[PDB]
Amino acid sequence: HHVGTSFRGKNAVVTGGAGGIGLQVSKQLLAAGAAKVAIIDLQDNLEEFVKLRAAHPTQSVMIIKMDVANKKGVEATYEEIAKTFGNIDIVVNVAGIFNDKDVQRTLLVNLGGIINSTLSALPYMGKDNGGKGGIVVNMSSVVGLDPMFIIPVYGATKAGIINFTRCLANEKYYQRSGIKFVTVCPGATMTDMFTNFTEKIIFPETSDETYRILDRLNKQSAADVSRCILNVLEKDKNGAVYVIEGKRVYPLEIKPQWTGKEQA
């Protein structure tokens, strides 16, 4: 029941917020007393959202059905959100999928959706456009940092997310816009995304060693990761990259790869 003060007065947009981690992120932000929370997702979860609005009468809970791969849709969706909200302090882009069999869809949803949502959010967040400034947390994976041979396509999009998000963490941009950019990379997690795993992988003969990804998923839940995300949000460290494993948050010091130390 109790609504808190941790995120009092904060307006927040959450892609993927109908299920899994995104749904918990939305709940926990409302529970922390976020003034307004918008949710962008493909699936309709009316029974969950009716309860959610009920439990948070003095808070805005806005739900939009939209494919984050849809560039113009996302743009449109943000326009509508902005007119009601007036400002966007927090964006957590959680929406993604796991399907190696469908390469095009993976790229456009996982990498494309992050990009679409991020670029779309910026005008309504940036100081130069009258915004207060804010933070964008982009969701990635551990396999984004360290490749996992079983899932090359899914991995690629996660490596792309990291590199993309770090770019925007430029000092010159921050001084102009006031927006910060953070990447979080969850490890073994109880996600429904990895259900029917071996039906969603390219090389079928890797089912023998598929234990690596799905053995210790119980280690952390969606709610655990969500708590880690809100923890990260409070840190407000620009350009930071976090790993979330075993219910815990680990910051990475990412050293440059090409420094010229190569010999010949």
Q: Which residues bind a second copy (CB under 8 A)?
A: 71, 103-104, 107-108, 111-112, 115-116, 119, 142-149, 151-153, 155-164, 166-168, 170, 172-173, 176, 185, 187, 202-203, 205-206, 209, 231, 235, 243, 248-252, 254, 256-258, 262-264
Alpha helices (runs of H) in the chain, residue ranges in sequence order:
20-31, 46-55, 71-85, 103-106, 112-125, 152-167, 171-177, 211-214, 222-235
Question: What is the sign, positive or negative, of the torsion defined by CA atoms of 38, 188, 156, 256?
Answer: positive
Single out the segment in contact with ligand NAD by CB under 6 A; choices: 6-14, 16-24, 121-129, 171-179.
16-24
Are the CB atoms for 126 and 89 separated by under 8 Å?
Answer: no
How near is the Cβ of 124 to a second copy at its closest, in Å? 16
Are the CB atoms for 38 and 77 separated by under 8 Å?
Answer: no
Looking at the annotation, which residues are catalytic? Answer: 154
Token digits of residue 153 = 């396509």
Residue 111: DSSP 8-state: I
Q: How far is residue 13's CA from residue 36's CA, in Å, rounded to a whole number?
A: 8
Q: Which does 7 bind (CB under 5 to 8 A by kind): ligand NAD, a second copy, none?
A: none
Are the CB atoms for 139 and 161 separated by under 8 Å?
Answer: yes
How near is the Cβ of 249 to a second copy at its closest, in Å? 5
Select 45 or 170, whichever has its Cβ closest to a second copy. 170
Which residues have CB under 8 Å from 62's CB, separation 6+? 36, 37, 38, 39, 81, 84, 85
For residue 218, state whether it binds ligand NAD (rule: CB under 6 A).
Answer: no
105 residue type, one letter? R
How near is the Cβ of 94 to ligand NAD at its closest, in Å? 5
Select 11 or 177, whichever has its Cβ closest to a second copy. 177
How near is the Cβ of 213 to a second copy at its closest, in Å? 13
Residue nearest to ligand NAD (CB): 20
Q: Residues 191, 227, 228, 245: which binds ligand NAD (CB under 6 A)?
A: 191
How near is the Cβ of 148 to ligand NAD at its closest, in Å? 8
Are the CB atoms for 39 and 19 separated by under 8 Å?
Answer: no
For residue 11, state whether it binds ligand NAD (rule: CB under 6 A).
Answer: no
Nearest to 154 by CA among 141, 166, 163: 141
Q: Which does 50 bind (CB under 5 to 8 A by kind): ligand NAD, a second copy, none?
A: none
Are the CB atoms for 149 and 206 separated by under 8 Å?
Answer: yes
Single out the segment in contact with ligand NAD by CB under 6 A; choices: 11-19, 163-171, 202-210, 245-253.
11-19
Q: What is the binding site for ligand NAD (CB under 6 A)? A: 15-16, 18-22, 40-43, 67-69, 94-97, 109, 113, 139, 141-143, 186-187, 189, 191-193, 222
